[PDB]
Amino acid sequence: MDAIKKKMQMLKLDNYHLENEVARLKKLVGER
């Protein structure tokens, strides 16, 4: 559990990074 409390924080952090990275990739590819 000690690693679980942080586990969700690890996937939650990567998510924000993936989103910010996706918002930058979508603006380069998904670009209008």
Place this chain on the structure above:
Amino acid sequence: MDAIKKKMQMLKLDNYHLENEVARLKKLVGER
């Protein structure tokens, strides 16, 4: 914790969905 075990399951599922989307975008931007 009951919601934690799933929390990581939701962040882990979104990660593969995000990486699966970034893996395609990266192949266009992060192109080696």
